PDB file of C-alpha atoms in Angstrom:
ATOM      1  CA  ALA A   1      72.824 121.697 102.152  1.00 19.67           C
ATOM      2  CA  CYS A   2      73.148 118.102 100.869  1.00 20.18           C
ATOM      3  CA  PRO A   3      76.595 116.534 100.817  1.00 22.79           C
ATOM      4  CA  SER A   4      77.892 116.089  97.247  1.00 24.84           C
ATOM      5  CA  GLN A   5      78.071 112.307  97.479  1.00 27.69           C
ATOM      6  CA  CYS A   6      74.552 111.868  98.923  1.00 27.52           C
ATOM      7  CA  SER A   7      70.754 112.252  98.292  1.00 25.03           C
ATOM      8  CA  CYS A   8      68.646 114.388 100.618  1.00 26.06           C
ATOM      9  CA  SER A   9      64.922 114.932 101.173  1.00 23.74           C
ATOM     10  CA  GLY A  10      63.293 116.663 104.112  1.00 25.51           C
ATOM     11  CA  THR A  11      65.393 115.318 107.052  1.00 25.06           C
ATOM     12  CA  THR A  12      66.710 112.101 105.460  1.00 24.00           C
ATOM     13  CA  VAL A  13      70.224 111.860 104.022  1.00 23.07           C
ATOM     14  CA  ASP A  14      70.986 108.757 101.936  1.00 21.30           C
ATOM     15  CA  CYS A  15      74.754 108.219 101.638  1.00 23.58           C
ATOM     16  CA  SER A  16      74.298 104.566 100.904  1.00 24.06           C
ATOM     17  CA  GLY A  17      75.924 102.324  98.318  1.00 20.76           C
ATOM     18  CA  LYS A  18      78.407 105.046  97.316  1.00 21.93           C
ATOM     19  CA  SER A  19      81.754 103.324  98.030  1.00 22.78           C
ATOM     20  CA  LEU A  20      82.519 105.675 100.916  1.00 22.02           C
ATOM     21  CA  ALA A  21      85.451 105.185 103.314  1.00 20.72           C
ATOM     22  CA  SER A  22      84.206 107.718 105.866  1.00 25.36           C
ATOM     23  CA  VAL A  23      81.209 109.821 106.801  1.00 23.47           C
ATOM     24  CA  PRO A  24      80.763 112.733 104.328  1.00 27.38           C
ATOM     25  CA  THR A  25      81.221 116.286 105.419  1.00 26.19           C
ATOM     26  CA  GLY A  26      78.234 118.667 105.526  1.00 26.16           C
ATOM     27  CA  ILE A  27      75.359 116.582 106.890  1.00 28.43           C
ATOM     28  CA  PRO A  28      72.812 119.188 108.039  1.00 28.08           C
ATOM     29  CA  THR A  29      72.534 119.238 111.855  1.00 26.25           C
ATOM     30  CA  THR A  30      68.768 118.991 111.510  1.00 25.67           C
ATOM     31  CA  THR A  31      69.128 115.459 109.946  1.00 23.66           C
ATOM     32  CA  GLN A  32      66.896 112.774 111.431  1.00 22.16           C
ATOM     33  CA  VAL A  33      67.777 109.807 109.278  1.00 17.66           C
ATOM     34  CA  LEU A  34      71.267 108.878 108.078  1.00 15.04           C
ATOM     35  CA  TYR A  35      71.840 105.955 105.751  1.00 16.43           C
ATOM     36  CA  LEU A  36      75.520 104.994 105.557  1.00 19.31           C
ATOM     37  CA  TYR A  37      74.926 101.308 104.778  1.00 15.52           C
ATOM     38  CA  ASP A  38      76.683  99.371 102.012  1.00 17.55           C
ATOM     39  CA  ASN A  39      79.948 101.386 101.888  1.00 15.44           C
ATOM     40  CA  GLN A  40      83.552 100.527 102.910  1.00 12.66           C
ATOM     41  CA  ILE A  41      83.875 102.586 106.099  1.00 13.84           C
ATOM     42  CA  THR A  42      86.674 101.024 108.268  1.00 16.08           C
ATOM     43  CA  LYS A  43      86.997 103.704 111.002  1.00 17.64           C
ATOM     44  CA  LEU A  44      84.750 106.506 112.206  1.00 17.74           C
ATOM     45  CA  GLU A  45      86.339 109.748 113.445  1.00 19.78           C
ATOM     46  CA  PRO A  46      85.714 110.373 117.173  1.00 25.51           C
ATOM     47  CA  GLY A  47      82.876 112.937 117.385  1.00 22.22           C
ATOM     48  CA  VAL A  48      81.687 112.377 113.791  1.00 24.96           C
ATOM     49  CA  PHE A  49      78.004 112.275 114.998  1.00 23.53           C
ATOM     50  CA  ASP A  50      78.208 114.659 117.959  1.00 24.00           C
ATOM     51  CA  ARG A  51      76.526 117.463 115.899  1.00 23.18           C
ATOM     52  CA  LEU A  52      73.750 115.166 114.601  1.00 28.83           C
ATOM     53  CA  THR A  53      71.756 115.194 117.853  1.00 27.37           C
ATOM     54  CA  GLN A  54      68.402 114.878 116.039  1.00 24.18           C
ATOM     55  CA  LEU A  55      69.147 111.481 114.458  1.00 24.98           C
ATOM     56  CA  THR A  56      66.293 109.019 115.098  1.00 24.62           C
ATOM     57  CA  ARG A  57      67.731 106.394 112.783  1.00 21.45           C
ATOM     58  CA  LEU A  58      71.261 105.467 111.794  1.00 17.56           C
ATOM     59  CA  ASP A  59      72.338 102.628 109.378  1.00 19.62           C
ATOM     60  CA  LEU A  60      76.048 101.725 109.579  1.00 19.69           C
ATOM     61  CA  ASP A  61      75.566  98.126 108.465  1.00 17.23           C
ATOM     62  CA  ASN A  62      77.447  96.437 105.677  1.00 19.31           C
ATOM     63  CA  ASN A  63      80.711  98.326 105.892  1.00 15.47           C
ATOM     64  CA  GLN A  64      84.100  97.220 107.122  1.00 17.20           C
ATOM     65  CA  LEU A  65      84.006  98.744 110.669  1.00 16.87           C
ATOM     66  CA  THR A  66      86.692  97.075 112.797  1.00 16.08           C
ATOM     67  CA  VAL A  67      86.451  99.293 115.854  1.00 13.72           C
ATOM     68  CA  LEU A  68      84.144 101.981 117.147  1.00 10.73           C
ATOM     69  CA  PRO A  69      85.469 105.215 118.719  1.00 14.96           C
ATOM     70  CA  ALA A  70      84.526 105.498 122.364  1.00 13.72           C
ATOM     71  CA  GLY A  71      81.550 107.863 122.795  1.00 13.86           C
ATOM     72  CA  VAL A  72      80.707 107.650 119.095  1.00 14.57           C
ATOM     73  CA  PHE A  73      76.909 107.630 119.957  1.00 13.01           C
ATOM     74  CA  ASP A  74      76.890 109.540 123.256  1.00 11.67           C
ATOM     75  CA  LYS A  75      74.944 112.568 121.869  1.00 11.42           C
ATOM     76  CA  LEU A  76      72.315 110.519 120.010  1.00 10.95           C
ATOM     77  CA  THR A  77      69.491 110.531 122.657  1.00 11.02           C
ATOM     78  CA  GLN A  78      66.705 110.480 120.071  1.00 15.62           C
ATOM     79  CA  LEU A  79      68.042 107.415 118.135  1.00 16.24           C
ATOM     80  CA  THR A  80      65.329 104.706 117.837  1.00 14.39           C
ATOM     81  CA  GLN A  81      67.076 102.359 115.293  1.00 11.82           C
ATOM     82  CA  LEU A  82      70.767 101.641 114.894  1.00 14.13           C
ATOM     83  CA  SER A  83      72.136  99.109 112.444  1.00 14.05           C
ATOM     84  CA  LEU A  84      75.742  97.767 112.999  1.00 15.47           C
ATOM     85  CA  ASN A  85      75.460  94.282 111.467  1.00 18.94           C
ATOM     86  CA  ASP A  86      77.764  92.913 108.764  1.00 19.29           C
ATOM     87  CA  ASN A  87      80.894  94.755 109.770  1.00 17.54           C
ATOM     88  CA  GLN A  88      84.249  93.599 111.193  1.00 21.93           C
ATOM     89  CA  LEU A  89      83.520  94.415 114.805  1.00 23.62           C
ATOM     90  CA  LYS A  90      85.106  92.406 117.619  1.00 26.35           C
ATOM     91  CA  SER A  91      83.613  94.290 120.560  1.00 27.34           C
ATOM     92  CA  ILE A  92      81.597  97.302 121.683  1.00 30.09           C
ATOM     93  CA  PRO A  93      83.465  99.978 123.746  1.00 30.31           C
ATOM     94  CA  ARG A  94      82.335  99.983 127.369  1.00 31.02           C
ATOM     95  CA  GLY A  95      79.305 102.226 127.790  1.00 32.13           C
ATOM     96  CA  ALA A  96      78.785 102.880 124.083  1.00 30.93           C
ATOM     97  CA  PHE A  97      74.935 102.295 124.136  1.00 30.79           C
ATOM     98  CA  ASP A  98      74.296 103.840 127.529  1.00 31.69           C
ATOM     99  CA  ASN A  99      73.055 107.234 126.203  1.00 32.14           C
ATOM    100  CA  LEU A 100      70.686 105.681 123.642  1.00 29.78           C
ATOM    101  CA  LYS A 101      67.584 106.255 125.769  1.00 29.36           C
ATOM    102  CA  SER A 102      65.214 106.170 122.716  1.00 30.27           C
ATOM    103  CA  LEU A 103      66.537 102.882 121.246  1.00 28.37           C
ATOM    104  CA  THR A 104      63.885 100.431 120.082  1.00 29.16           C
ATOM    105  CA  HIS A 105      66.005  98.354 117.561  1.00 30.86           C
ATOM    106  CA  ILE A 106      69.648  97.467 117.130  1.00 29.57           C
ATOM    107  CA  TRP A 107      71.190  94.949 114.604  1.00 29.97           C
ATOM    108  CA  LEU A 108      74.463  93.305 115.760  1.00 31.27           C
ATOM    109  CA  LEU A 109      74.812  90.028 113.705  1.00 33.01           C
ATOM    110  CA  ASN A 110      77.477  89.154 111.050  1.00 32.39           C
ATOM    111  CA  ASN A 111      80.345  90.551 113.088  1.00 36.29           C
ATOM    112  CA  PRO A 112      83.366  88.543 114.336  1.00 37.25           C
ATOM    113  CA  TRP A 113      82.514  89.146 118.043  1.00 35.07           C
ATOM    114  CA  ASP A 114      85.585  88.031 119.981  1.00 37.47           C
ATOM    115  CA  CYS A 115      84.255  86.156 122.989  1.00 38.58           C
ATOM    116  CA  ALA A 116      87.702  85.021 124.229  1.00 35.53           C
ATOM    117  CA  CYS A 117      88.521  88.650 125.062  1.00 33.30           C
ATOM    118  CA  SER A 118      87.325  90.613 128.071  1.00 33.20           C
ATOM    119  CA  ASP A 119      86.125  93.622 126.037  1.00 34.15           C
ATOM    120  CA  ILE A 120      83.054  91.499 124.948  1.00 34.26           C
ATOM    121  CA  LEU A 121      81.651  91.731 128.473  1.00 37.12           C
ATOM    122  CA  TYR A 122      79.926  95.148 128.096  1.00 36.23           C
ATOM    123  CA  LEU A 123      78.090  93.842 125.006  1.00 32.96           C
ATOM    124  CA  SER A 124      77.208  90.495 126.681  1.00 32.13           C
ATOM    125  CA  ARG A 125      75.758  92.317 129.686  1.00 30.60           C
ATOM    126  CA  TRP A 126      74.062  95.010 127.610  1.00 33.39           C
ATOM    127  CA  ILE A 127      72.207  92.432 125.422  1.00 31.29           C
ATOM    128  CA  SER A 128      71.142  90.430 128.485  1.00 31.95           C
ATOM    129  CA  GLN A 129      69.796  93.709 130.070  1.00 30.59           C
ATOM    130  CA  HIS A 130      67.902  94.825 126.873  1.00 32.97           C
ATOM    131  CA  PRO A 131      66.195  91.492 125.827  1.00 34.88           C
ATOM    132  CA  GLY A 132      63.656  93.298 123.595  1.00 34.47           C
ATOM    133  CA  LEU A 133      66.023  95.535 121.577  1.00 36.83           C
ATOM    134  CA  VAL A 134      68.168  93.228 119.459  1.00 39.39           C
ATOM    135  CA  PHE A 135      66.973  92.024 116.040  1.00 39.66           C
ATOM    136  CA  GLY A 136      68.283  89.535 113.612  1.00 40.46           C
ATOM    137  CA  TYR A 137      67.652  89.208 109.858  1.00 35.92           C
ATOM    138  CA  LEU A 138      64.031  88.436 110.602  1.00 33.07           C
ATOM    139  CA  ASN A 139      62.489  89.234 113.983  1.00 34.49           C
ATOM    140  CA  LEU A 140      63.525  89.902 117.626  1.00 36.33           C
ATOM    141  CA  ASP A 141      66.598  87.797 118.484  1.00 35.29           C
ATOM    142  CA  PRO A 142      68.996  88.461 121.417  1.00 34.18           C
ATOM    143  CA  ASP A 143      71.126  85.428 120.317  1.00 37.42           C
ATOM    144  CA  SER A 144      71.795  86.825 116.890  1.00 34.44           C
ATOM    145  CA  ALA A 145      75.038  88.375 118.123  1.00 32.16           C
ATOM    146  CA  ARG A 146      77.324  85.325 117.899  1.00 33.67           C
ATOM    147  CA  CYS A 147      80.929  84.643 118.908  1.00 36.14           C
ATOM    148  CA  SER A 148      83.293  84.147 115.978  1.00 36.75           C
ATOM    149  CA  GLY A 149      84.426  80.506 115.586  1.00 37.58           C
ATOM    150  CA  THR A 150      82.139  78.874 118.188  1.00 41.35           C
ATOM    151  CA  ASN A 151      78.872  80.507 116.952  1.00 42.77           C
ATOM    152  CA  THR A 152      77.421  80.683 120.490  1.00 44.59           C
ATOM    153  CA  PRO A 153      75.386  83.708 121.636  1.00 46.91           C
ATOM    154  CA  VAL A 154      77.450  86.705 122.978  1.00 43.01           C
ATOM    155  CA  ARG A 155      74.827  87.305 125.716  1.00 40.69           C
ATOM    156  CA  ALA A 156      75.718  83.927 127.206  1.00 42.88           C
ATOM    157  CA  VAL A 157      79.443  84.855 127.592  1.00 44.38           C
ATOM    158  CA  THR A 158      80.392  85.585 131.246  1.00 43.15           C
ATOM    159  CA  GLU A 159      83.646  86.822 132.915  1.00 45.03           C
ATOM    160  CA  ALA A 160      85.103  83.279 133.519  1.00 49.06           C
ATOM    161  CA  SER A 161      85.383  82.248 129.835  1.00 46.74           C
ATOM    162  CA  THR A 162      87.235  85.476 128.904  1.00 44.63           C
ATOM    163  CA  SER A 163      90.796  86.806 129.508  1.00 42.82           C
ATOM    164  CA  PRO A 164      92.360  90.305 129.338  1.00 45.36           C
ATOM    165  CA  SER A 165      95.395  88.731 127.647  1.00 45.55           C
ATOM    166  CA  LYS A 166      93.382  87.915 124.476  1.00 44.02           C
ATOM    167  CA  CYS A 167      92.652  91.514 123.363  1.00 47.97           C
TER     168      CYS A 167
ATOM    169  CA  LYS B   1      46.619  79.602 100.016  1.00 46.81           C
ATOM    170  CA  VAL B   2      46.819  77.410 103.110  1.00 46.94           C
ATOM    171  CA  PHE B   3      48.990  74.310 102.236  1.00 50.25           C
ATOM    172  CA  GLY B   4      48.445  70.905 103.854  1.00 49.82           C
ATOM    173  CA  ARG B   5      51.576  69.484 105.507  1.00 46.73           C
ATOM    174  CA  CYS B   6      52.257  66.849 102.817  1.00 45.46           C
ATOM    175  CA  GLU B   7      51.286  69.212 100.037  1.00 43.58           C
ATOM    176  CA  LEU B   8      53.912  71.677 101.339  1.00 44.74           C
ATOM    177  CA  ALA B   9      56.550  68.995 101.915  1.00 43.46           C
ATOM    178  CA  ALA B  10      56.004  67.817  98.298  1.00 42.42           C
ATOM    179  CA  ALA B  11      56.425  71.352  96.937  1.00 42.73           C
ATOM    180  CA  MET B  12      59.534  72.083  99.070  1.00 43.30           C
ATOM    181  CA  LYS B  13      61.244  68.893  97.815  1.00 43.08           C
ATOM    182  CA  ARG B  14      60.717  69.690  94.134  1.00 41.86           C
ATOM    183  CA  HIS B  15      62.133  73.214  94.811  1.00 43.05           C
ATOM    184  CA  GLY B  16      65.132  71.477  96.273  1.00 45.04           C
ATOM    185  CA  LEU B  17      64.891  72.305  99.973  1.00 48.35           C
ATOM    186  CA  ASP B  18      65.677  68.716 101.076  1.00 49.51           C
ATOM    187  CA  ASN B  19      69.205  68.737 102.465  1.00 47.79           C
ATOM    188  CA  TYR B  20      69.748  72.297 101.216  1.00 43.35           C
ATOM    189  CA  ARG B  21      72.887  73.412 103.141  1.00 43.20           C
ATOM    190  CA  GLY B  22      72.543  70.158 105.113  1.00 41.23           C
ATOM    191  CA  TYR B  23      68.986  70.768 106.396  1.00 40.52           C
ATOM    192  CA  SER B  24      66.622  67.876 105.798  1.00 41.69           C
ATOM    193  CA  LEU B  25      63.164  68.598 104.319  1.00 39.54           C
ATOM    194  CA  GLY B  26      61.385  68.287 107.691  1.00 38.43           C
ATOM    195  CA  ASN B  27      63.239  71.348 109.102  1.00 41.41           C
ATOM    196  CA  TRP B  28      61.692  73.670 106.457  1.00 39.56           C
ATOM    197  CA  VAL B  29      58.200  72.275 106.916  1.00 38.89           C
ATOM    198  CA  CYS B  30      58.538  72.651 110.700  1.00 41.48           C
ATOM    199  CA  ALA B  31      59.781  76.265 110.192  1.00 41.29           C
ATOM    200  CA  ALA B  32      56.824  77.238 107.929  1.00 43.18           C
ATOM    201  CA  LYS B  33      54.386  75.668 110.430  1.00 42.24           C
ATOM    202  CA  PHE B  34      55.442  77.936 113.244  1.00 43.68           C
ATOM    203  CA  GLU B  35      55.948  80.978 110.957  1.00 42.92           C
ATOM    204  CA  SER B  36      52.650  81.087 108.947  1.00 43.57           C
ATOM    205  CA  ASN B  37      50.824  77.877 109.758  1.00 40.28           C
ATOM    206  CA  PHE B  38      51.273  76.958 106.097  1.00 40.43           C
ATOM    207  CA  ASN B  39      49.358  80.070 104.968  1.00 40.51           C
ATOM    208  CA  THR B  40      51.135  81.875 102.097  1.00 41.97           C
ATOM    209  CA  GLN B  41      49.197  85.055 102.756  1.00 43.61           C
ATOM    210  CA  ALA B  42      50.317  85.499 106.404  1.00 45.09           C
ATOM    211  CA  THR B  43      51.359  89.101 106.893  1.00 45.99           C
ATOM    212  CA  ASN B  44      52.765  90.774 110.058  1.00 46.55           C
ATOM    213  CA  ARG B  45      53.510  94.468 110.518  1.00 46.70           C
ATOM    214  CA  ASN B  46      56.606  95.039 112.646  1.00 45.38           C
ATOM    215  CA  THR B  47      57.422  97.882 115.043  1.00 45.55           C
ATOM    216  CA  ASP B  48      60.331  99.169 112.984  1.00 44.79           C
ATOM    217  CA  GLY B  49      58.029  99.784 109.945  1.00 42.47           C
ATOM    218  CA  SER B  50      58.887  96.499 108.155  1.00 41.59           C
ATOM    219  CA  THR B  51      56.359  93.681 107.467  1.00 41.16           C
ATOM    220  CA  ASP B  52      56.813  89.885 107.491  1.00 39.83           C
ATOM    221  CA  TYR B  53      55.509  88.027 104.379  1.00 36.85           C
ATOM    222  CA  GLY B  54      54.626  84.518 103.249  1.00 36.36           C
ATOM    223  CA  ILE B  55      54.992  80.959 104.648  1.00 39.67           C
ATOM    224  CA  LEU B  56      58.350  81.682 106.314  1.00 43.23           C
ATOM    225  CA  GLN B  57      57.532  85.262 107.288  1.00 45.08           C
ATOM    226  CA  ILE B  58      60.351  86.962 105.342  1.00 42.54           C
ATOM    227  CA  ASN B  59      61.074  90.585 106.392  1.00 46.03           C
ATOM    228  CA  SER B  60      60.872  93.737 104.192  1.00 47.27           C
ATOM    229  CA  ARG B  61      63.715  95.519 106.007  1.00 43.10           C
ATOM    230  CA  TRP B  62      66.286  93.311 104.320  1.00 41.14           C
ATOM    231  CA  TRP B  63      64.927  90.918 101.804  1.00 45.97           C
ATOM    232  CA  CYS B  64      61.998  91.979  99.664  1.00 43.82           C
ATOM    233  CA  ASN B  65      60.365  95.169  98.336  1.00 45.14           C
ATOM    234  CA  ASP B  66      56.964  96.353  99.510  1.00 46.01           C
ATOM    235  CA  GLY B  67      57.534 100.023  98.668  1.00 47.03           C
ATOM    236  CA  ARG B  68      56.622 101.127 102.218  1.00 49.51           C
ATOM    237  CA  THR B  69      59.645 100.065 104.239  1.00 50.94           C
ATOM    238  CA  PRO B  70      61.999 103.105 104.392  1.00 50.23           C
ATOM    239  CA  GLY B  71      65.804 102.407 104.045  1.00 51.13           C
ATOM    240  CA  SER B  72      65.089  98.814 103.371  1.00 49.75           C
ATOM    241  CA  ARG B  73      67.006  96.611 101.086  1.00 51.44           C
ATOM    242  CA  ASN B  74      65.758  94.112  98.628  1.00 49.92           C
ATOM    243  CA  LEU B  75      68.485  91.405  98.949  1.00 51.65           C
ATOM    244  CA  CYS B  76      66.312  88.776  97.237  1.00 53.10           C
ATOM    245  CA  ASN B  77      65.344  91.105  94.394  1.00 53.81           C
ATOM    246  CA  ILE B  78      61.662  90.375  94.661  1.00 58.71           C
ATOM    247  CA  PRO B  79      58.425  92.202  95.398  1.00 55.43           C
ATOM    248  CA  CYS B  80      57.116  91.100  98.801  1.00 55.45           C
ATOM    249  CA  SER B  81      53.747  90.325  97.104  1.00 59.31           C
ATOM    250  CA  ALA B  82      55.428  87.449  95.167  1.00 60.00           C
ATOM    251  CA  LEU B  83      55.963  86.039  98.720  1.00 61.95           C
ATOM    252  CA  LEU B  84      52.160  85.888  99.093  1.00 64.96           C
ATOM    253  CA  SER B  85      51.597  83.591  96.047  1.00 65.65           C
ATOM    254  CA  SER B  86      50.139  80.109  96.092  1.00 66.77           C
ATOM    255  CA  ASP B  87      53.322  79.417  94.095  1.00 64.61           C
ATOM    256  CA  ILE B  88      56.053  78.969  96.806  1.00 63.65           C
ATOM    257  CA  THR B  89      58.878  79.506  94.287  1.00 65.76           C
ATOM    258  CA  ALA B  90      59.859  83.060  95.376  1.00 63.43           C
ATOM    259  CA  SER B  91      59.611  82.173  99.139  1.00 63.95           C
ATOM    260  CA  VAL B  92      61.911  79.146  98.544  1.00 61.97           C
ATOM    261  CA  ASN B  93      64.462  81.278  96.604  1.00 60.16           C
ATOM    262  CA  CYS B  94      64.470  84.011  99.269  1.00 61.67           C
ATOM    263  CA  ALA B  95      64.775  81.368 102.101  1.00 65.85           C
ATOM    264  CA  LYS B  96      67.874  79.784 100.400  1.00 68.93           C
ATOM    265  CA  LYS B  97      69.401  83.265 100.190  1.00 64.81           C
ATOM    266  CA  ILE B  98      68.728  83.787 103.921  1.00 64.62           C
ATOM    267  CA  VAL B  99      70.332  80.476 104.929  1.00 65.15           C
ATOM    268  CA  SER B 100      73.529  81.324 102.994  1.00 62.24           C
ATOM    269  CA  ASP B 101      73.792  85.127 103.840  1.00 60.74           C
ATOM    270  CA  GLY B 102      73.091  84.317 107.507  1.00 63.03           C
ATOM    271  CA  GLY B 103      71.720  79.224 108.857  1.00 63.46           C
ATOM    272  CA  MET B 104      68.121  78.316 109.834  1.00 65.02           C
ATOM    273  CA  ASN B 105      68.944  80.048 113.099  1.00 64.26           C
ATOM    274  CA  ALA B 106      67.313  83.116 111.589  1.00 61.37           C
ATOM    275  CA  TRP B 107      63.900  81.525 112.267  1.00 61.07           C
ATOM    276  CA  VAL B 108      63.723  81.723 116.103  1.00 60.47           C
ATOM    277  CA  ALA B 109      60.575  79.506 116.422  1.00 60.12           C
ATOM    278  CA  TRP B 110      62.424  76.748 114.470  1.00 64.03           C
ATOM    279  CA  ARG B 111      65.426  77.112 116.777  1.00 65.18           C
ATOM    280  CA  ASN B 112      63.257  76.645 119.823  1.00 63.23           C
ATOM    281  CA  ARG B 113      60.602  74.192 118.590  1.00 59.99           C
ATOM    282  CA  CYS B 114      62.072  72.224 115.637  1.00 58.92           C
ATOM    283  CA  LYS B 115      65.898  72.127 115.835  1.00 62.80           C
ATOM    284  CA  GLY B 116      67.302  68.877 117.183  1.00 59.76           C
ATOM    285  CA  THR B 117      63.903  67.094 117.235  1.00 59.95           C
ATOM    286  CA  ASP B 118      62.709  64.099 115.175  1.00 61.90           C
ATOM    287  CA  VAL B 119      61.940  66.656 112.369  1.00 59.33           C
ATOM    288  CA  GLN B 120      61.389  63.962 109.767  1.00 59.09           C
ATOM    289  CA  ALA B 121      58.057  63.500 111.644  1.00 58.74           C
ATOM    290  CA  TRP B 122      56.933  66.605 109.693  1.00 58.35           C
ATOM    291  CA  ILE B 123      57.339  64.429 106.628  1.00 56.69           C
ATOM    292  CA  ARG B 124      55.540  61.195 107.747  1.00 58.59           C
ATOM    293  CA  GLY B 125      53.105  59.756 105.196  1.00 59.99           C
ATOM    294  CA  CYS B 126      53.913  62.266 102.429  1.00 57.44           C
TER     295      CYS B 126
END
């Protein structure tokens, strides 16, 4: 059953470029590919993807995401590609990528990563520990996630240049 | 078409790459050298299902249409085959888009091999 707002075909659901503020209701639980890119989604509901356990690809890029719910991707153990670039994200919740055991590609660039704040540390460590997973606008690029203002690579940020008071 | 260095420098200048967004001509020549070795028909299939095309190896996930990259965008509004032309016009127009939407930091080989060097060497004798 396709959601009203979207196009469907086999296991792909294209909800892209539809001016959406949140994830549409009624995505079949058999869905493997979910395009949500080019919308105006600011917040995801906690658990919004918990039923979509078969997702192998998810595009969330080019929205207005400011914050991600903790455990938003915890049930997505078949995800190979996740796109999060070109949002308003300042950090990744601690542990948020840990269950993504099938990941081959993630896009992180064009976000205001806030490297002054201590929440950036999970992301900094995660990128450093997964040097072949992060892609920029072209090819493989672990430095493409860049601190707002200073434009230095997130993966370079360590505990001593951060503070818990800046979050 | 495989360009010579000066031949490519000459064509990049007349397309207006010299000092585009503050990058001197030699930067773009140095980029294209490490991306394609000056060969407009360089092609590279990526693991995500995209392909890289042309002298600056522009990707079909974001920038051009090849009709075989699923969920891809066409931010430059061009067929990826236009990026294979002996006419560098489409590859220059797409590159300019990339520098603005992203700058040259998108080209990792340029960042590591070209950036901060005497890059006007790429331009000597042209």
